[PDB]
């Protein structure tokens, strides 16, 4: 099986490398993560929370992470250039809470004591693209407020806060709702807007959960009572639309078995999202993904990184 032959038989094209972000495309970086290395990372189910994680498996430029003390059914894959993972000790030097291994208390945990007990190695610092040493997203301070699409109820644009800032990204939280709605952004995110956007647009603004007299929510009053400032309007940047076109081919991580990466096709497109189809499979498995998601790649990515590529289901 080769891309060349397949693109020949299917009279098709891959999405050009130049349509992807550098981080989605890069193949020449070695994976320096090793089995059993320990580190800190975001829980994909609770994006505001940080946990101790151990390298459980490595495949090409990808690694499987395991939550120390918890069940192996929570393991997840990331790329070796993930910004969502950090070296041991990062939480304390940067103002982040670390959830201890299952069974520990928070001040019963130290890295030096834990590495002694486990006889494990911390993943070396030079492996991590994100250590809170890069330029911050200009204008986005912790505690500032903004309006944001609830991506889990995306008809709603809502009162939101910046709750975390790490290198070039920041964490959006929906005031008085739980953290499961939190998501990480940069200043060009198409899902976020300055305070006052909804009313300039003539769109309803969803106030904090159970806010008194929700219809008469007023930004100026809410800001004053919470002792908060709005993110300034100049900090918000326009992201240009992607240029992926229908039928272009690429490589995508399987959401149903994320250890796999499959031959894929652009099935449909929006300004900032693409609908993926896995060639050879039911359209029931098709799915929308943001164009900047870390789990889509140009053709050749698997080959060049040392990851198996799943070829289309044949007859």
């Amino acid at each position: 099986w080769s891309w060349e032959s397949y693109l020949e038989e299917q009279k098709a094209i891959t999405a050009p490398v130049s349509l992807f972000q550098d981080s989605q495309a890069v193949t020449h970086n070695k994976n320096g993560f090793k089995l059993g290395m320990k580190l800190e990372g975001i829980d994909p189910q609770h994006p505001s929370m940080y946990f101790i994680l151990t390298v459980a498996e490595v495949c090409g430029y990808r690694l499987r992470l395991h939550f120390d003390g918890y069940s192996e059914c929570h393991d997840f894959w990331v790329n070796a250039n993930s910004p969502d993972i950090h070296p041991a000790g990062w939480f304390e030097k940067t103002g982040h809470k670390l959830q201890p291994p299952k069974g520990y208390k928070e001040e019963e945990f130290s890295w030096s004591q834990y590495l002694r007990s486990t006889r494990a190695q911390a993943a070396p610092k030079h492996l991590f693209v994100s250590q809170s040493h890069s330029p911050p997203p200009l204008g986005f301070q912790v505690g500032m407020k903004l309006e944001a699409v609830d991506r889990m109820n995306p008809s709603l644009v809502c009162v939101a806060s910046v709750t975390d800032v790490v290198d070039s990204r920041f964490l959006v939280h929906f005031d008085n709702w739980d953290d499961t709605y939190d998501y990480w952004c940069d200043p060009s995110s198409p899902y976020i807007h300055p305070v006052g956007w909804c009313q300039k647009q003539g769109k309803p603004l969803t106030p904090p959960q159970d806010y008194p007299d929700p219809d008469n929510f007023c930004w100026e009053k809410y800001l004053e009572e919470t002792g908060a400032s709005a993110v300034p309007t100049w900090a918000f940047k326009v992201r240009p639309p992607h240029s992926f076109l229908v039928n272009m081919k690429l490589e995508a991580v399987d959401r149903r078995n994320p250890a796999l990466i499959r031959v894929a096709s652009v099935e449909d497109v929006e300004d900032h999202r693409i609908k993926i189809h896995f060639d050879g499979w039911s359209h029931g498995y098709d799915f929308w993904i943001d164009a900047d998601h870390p789990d889509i790649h140009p053709a050749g990515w698997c080959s060049k990184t040392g990851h198996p590529l799943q070829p289309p289901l044949g007859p």
Partner: peptide, 9 residues
């Protein structure tokens, strides 16, 4: 996983 829903509690 429940969507946002208008309720009266």
């Amino acid at each position: 996983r429940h969507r946002k829903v208008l309720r009266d509690n």
